[PDB]
From a paper:
Here, by studying CRLs in the [name]–[name]–F-box ([name]) family, we show how neddylated [name] ligases and ARIH1 (an [name]-type E3 ligase) co-evolved to ubiquitylate diverse substrates presented on various F-box proteins. Notably, numerous cellular neddylated SCFs and some other CRLs have been reported to associate with ARIH1, an E3, to form ‘E3–E3’ ligases in which ARIH1 serves as the ubiquitin-carrying enzyme. We developed activity-based chemical probes that enabled cryo-electron microscopy visualization of steps in E3–E3 ubiquitylation, initiating with ubiquitin linked to the E2 enzyme UBE2L3, then transferred to the catalytic cysteine of ARIH1, and culminating in ubiquitin linkage to a substrate bound to the [name] E3 ligase.
CRLs are multiprotein assemblies that contain a core ‘catalytic’ CUL–RBX (also known as cullin–RING) complex and an interchangeable substrate-specific receptor. Much of our understanding of CRLs comes from studies of the [name] family, in which different F-box proteins (about 70 in total in humans) act as receptors that recognize distinct substrates. Different members of this E3 family are denoted as [name] combined with a superscript name of the specific F-box protein in the complex (for example, SCFFBXW7 denotes an [name] complex in which the F-box protein is FBXW7).
Residue numbers in the entry:
A (entry chain C): 17 to 55, 84 to 148, 157 to 340
B (entry chain P): 27 to 93, 181 to 190
C (entry chain T): 95 to 401, 406 to 419
D (entry chain Y): 175 to 321, 325 to 343, 346 to 432
E (entry chain K): 5 to 73
F (entry chain L): 13 to 153, 156 to 298
G (entry chain S): 2 to 33, 38 to 64, 82 to 160
Amino acid sequence: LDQIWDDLRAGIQQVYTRQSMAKSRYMELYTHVYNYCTSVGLELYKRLKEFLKNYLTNLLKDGEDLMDESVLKFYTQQWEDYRFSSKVLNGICAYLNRHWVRREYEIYSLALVTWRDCLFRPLNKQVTNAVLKLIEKERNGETINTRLISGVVQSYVELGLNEDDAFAKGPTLTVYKESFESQFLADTERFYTRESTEFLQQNPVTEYMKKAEARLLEEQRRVQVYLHESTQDELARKCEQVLIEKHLEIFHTEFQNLLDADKNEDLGRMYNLVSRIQDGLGELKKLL
Amino acid sequence: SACRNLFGPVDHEELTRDLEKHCRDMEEASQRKWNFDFQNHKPLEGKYEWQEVEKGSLPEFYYRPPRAGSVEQTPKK
Amino acid sequence: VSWDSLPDELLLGIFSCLCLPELLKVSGVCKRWYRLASDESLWQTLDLTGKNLHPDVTGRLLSQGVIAFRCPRSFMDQPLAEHFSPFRVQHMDLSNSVIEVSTLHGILSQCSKLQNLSLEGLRLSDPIVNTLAKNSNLVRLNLSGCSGFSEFALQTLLSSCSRLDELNLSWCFDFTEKHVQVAVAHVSETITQLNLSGYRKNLQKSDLSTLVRRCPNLVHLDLSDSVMLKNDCFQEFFQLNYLQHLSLSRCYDIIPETLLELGEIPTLKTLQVFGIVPDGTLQLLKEALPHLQINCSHFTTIARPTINQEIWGIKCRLTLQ
Amino acid sequence: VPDYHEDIHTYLREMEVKCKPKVGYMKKQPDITNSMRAILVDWLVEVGEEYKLQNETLHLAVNYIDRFLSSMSVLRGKLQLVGTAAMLLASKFEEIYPPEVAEFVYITDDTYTKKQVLRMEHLVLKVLTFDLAAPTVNQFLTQYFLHANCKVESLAMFLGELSLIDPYLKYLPSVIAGAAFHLALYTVTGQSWPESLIRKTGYTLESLKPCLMDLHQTYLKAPQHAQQSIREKYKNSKYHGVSLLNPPETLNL
Amino acid sequence: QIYYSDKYDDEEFEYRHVMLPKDIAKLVPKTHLMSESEWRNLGVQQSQGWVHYMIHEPEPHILLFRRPL
Amino acid sequence: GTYGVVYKARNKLTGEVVALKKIRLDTETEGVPSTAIREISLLKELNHPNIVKLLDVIHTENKLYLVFEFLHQDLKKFMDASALTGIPLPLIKSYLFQLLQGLAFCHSHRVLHRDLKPQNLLINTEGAIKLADFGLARAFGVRTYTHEVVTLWYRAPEILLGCKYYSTAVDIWSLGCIFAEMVTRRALFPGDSEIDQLFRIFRTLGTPDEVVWPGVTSMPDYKPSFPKWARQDFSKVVPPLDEDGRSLLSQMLHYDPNKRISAKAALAHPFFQDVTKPVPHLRL
Amino acid sequence: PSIKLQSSDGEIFEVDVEIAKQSVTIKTMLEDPVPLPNVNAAILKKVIQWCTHHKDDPPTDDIPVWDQEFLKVDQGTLFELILAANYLDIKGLLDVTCKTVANMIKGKTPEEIRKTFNIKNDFTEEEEAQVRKENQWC
């Protein structure tokens, strides 16, 4: 029908850019939806998809093109608001999900798919690059607004595509793995490889060991407050393979001279480090 | 629901006496016309020649009670 | 009130609480209800146990969208006259029915998504099996007592079918050494349960050896009434690893005593040896290997749909008592 | 096949006059009243329903009750045991799997012992002298129905049983059967007594006028009667629930 | 116990039926009928080729076999 | 051995045949048997030359006495005596006439026998034969009754295929079987069990089908996987019997109950309208 | 707490939140005087009564007798009640109403059913013989 469509579109305009409308309006919208589905709502479904594509493209037109530190405070806000309002919209058109979508596309999933097709824009690489730039404060600086990161992390977790893949099973972190974790790991390796060597070329190895242990504990903590839990193991493996596992000869020399020295405590930290890596102790025991 | 009473229990030995005095009607006529001691399963003096016919004479209805090797082939019996 | 104003979903909700005779009855009310009497959502699971019927009627019913079609011991010895679309039936049971070869060929030349089957006792032929080869998804199968097809047809069938979980090619009374040879040569590699009994003077040593060195996942096996099985066959089974249920009943060429070796296979659970073990000596066998169960399951289980009206755990809703 | 139908009809018409009980018998009883036998027969139909028996059992049981009371008096408390014994007789004669004596000595709330039931059983056999194949209305109705829809029969049996609830004993069972059939046919569809029945049984409408008007008036008075176990029983869909329809106020005879 | 029957045949098949005692008859499956290995396990003793082909509902303790000519 | 006691009486009467029957009644088990009640009530209501008469009923505290009518010999022993000689044709015709008369009377008076067999037919020394064993009688008005009838040797395809209504045409089947039996001194259908019985019936009269028996395929216990036998020539089934008798037997052992002749219809057969009345030739 | 449920004509019935939570539509609306322009007070009161009767459920086919007697009412109200249950999307109530209608259809013939439900027959007198021909095997 037509006369229903105008008021429905106006109401959906109202639900986005939320102003906390009253339940009377919401029942009016629900009653419209129910009334049209009793006379088989393919046409209304098509109109809904069309409208969402239009609105989200228009929103993309504005607010974009910032390249850092403001693509985040824009993207997280827009993603949060859009997710909430789309959840409400799924609440409204609940009669479709029961009687026509059952012969195959749920409204919430359609909205997530459309926002995914907003993700495959420069808005995907820009935000990831800016997050990498912000976490470049691995060195220092308590300016890391964690609310500017956790939002994007959760968004990447959530947007795992689901449109009739199989069904809603649980964690679908495909997009997270293939668009954020790889770059993060590569940058982590690169930065640590640079800084560890430049620090070694200027200092005695004891401070190197201390800094290595400190950075290890820091990078184990960091995941619990920034990133999804299915990341700790690989990050630990890579940071160990970089901070240690590639200066073993220096470890052997310092091992010899610390046996020439009189520290039984760097003993323990050295043991913990070398135990963190595979088969190290054999070279430690053999020269021992 | 159908488990109902109408009047409560009533005396019973008067019922027994009444019914047995009722049953004392087939005691004079039974002896008269059939001259057989039915209550005692005994015959009587006569007028009806009582015998005990052998079982094989009359048809049975009158006394019927109420109601490597070990091959796979065929071994005859 | 004009109840013809109800929406389709509510009408289906109402109809989905009926029984087959009444659902048939309400079909003749008005054209809309006639439409809704066949809407591919009420006709999930049908049942026609022993009810005589006619090939066109059964074809129309299957085309309506049947999934679990159970029709054992019903007779259809009449010609099929109409064409259809490829069917959607998945669990087709036709055991023991007196049916004609042409009718069975016609009905089987339509189904192609067959996930399961059973053709017990029937008589088959070359076009039958050739058409049956298309079902590249047969989890199970059964051909017990069937007879008529040829070696080339058998090998083509078994080559075409690969995912086959359980096979039961038993007791066919026209096989030869060639048939059993090609069977063991071309059987798939996934067989969990297999039965090859009956072939007394046709199952030979090289055959069993080829079978055991081809398929390593036999969980249930039986070779009853095989008269050429020996000690090396026993060690052939020792090469097998998951044989939880064996039966060599009436294998006349075998002494009772070598059977004690069988318990040395770890994962065995049962052994049915009717015919060879004389009386009394069964207690000897039990005490010799008391970690088993000897002569306790009289009847097979390999792809028999029913062992209780439920076909393969699926329950039929549309029925005729 | 009609090879025997008319012969059986004639034979039944002959039998029905031999087993007809006395009409004025009721006053002879010192401490029983027609209202009391009405309560007893109501209990009786309740029992017959709850055990899932046949109505011909009820008709034979009430016939034995009548031919026993009309030929023998008894004190107050024994009507219940007499009714139970009549039920046993009718069930054993007719119904396929008769209930046992235990159920009947139970449904009386265990008020009497089994042996007294056996003794009064002997008694009822004695007075009846083993004459139990009596004719009743239902056979006549079933014969009539051959000359129609299930509702007609349900109403007809309804009227007949309402009649046997308690002034009709003047009429013969064939008479009551015919009057009930005609009235029920008129009530359900307005059709009149066909000519084939007049040919067969010889009855005409005028010969059955008095019982017909008695059935009409008692049908009117029935819904307000003090007892309606028959009404609630025929409320069931098995009988098409036809006990709830309106008693026509005036006929078009 | 196991009582066999004589052979009665038509122009194309030849038949036989077999009775069972209570203990043996209590075993028969009421869903599917059997095969030669099955009833030989039961305890029938006869030739090669007889096919079990019918169940009679009123009396389950009777089996019916046939085999071609 | 062969326990029991009987009694007679012969004083002054033309119909002087009497015999006493006593039936035990256990004091507290169901009381009077249903068979006893059906027997007595259905028997003291019939009177006919071709039917045993009941004279009195005596009911004690724990026993029952029935003053039946004595008679000489039944049929089983009589045929066994003449098993090698055969039975004279006029005697057969007279016996069949009396049997048909008795059946016509019993079925007119709404009584079903359902238990006819030669062991329950009693003959006199003058050729008169009378029925007996009215313990299985039931007064039919047709409803669904009891699903156990005469005997596997003399049942009918109505009951064997488990039909629901078995109105009064089964006695005709039993009578036909008895008639052919005494004619050939061989029971036509010597069944081992119901399946053997059905297979024998088919072997003699061919496999039933819709053409022969309308609505046969829908019977509760039909399975078209039955053997495909053909109706043999009716002649060698009953050799010593003529053409007209063959016609009567063929229209008296017809499958369909509706196409099976009744009693009074059978009374008018040519074969049958020729009527004699001889006396039995051997001791009774 | 409680909610002010307003019918199509203002019959505001204040009802416990845990009672209205039974209806899925109201549940989701509350998740994030309310008029329901498709239900009048007559049906709404009966719905509230039923929900209060089933408010503490655990959460043929053994129809509860309470509902059965509650359903012992005439046709038009049953029709309106089924529509209201669908509109508010309450599982058990819609299920029991559907089952009752089903059992009430059981038994009758096409003529009787067509008569009682005010169903307008069409395309008949020439094809019903054919459609019955499609159904001998019943």
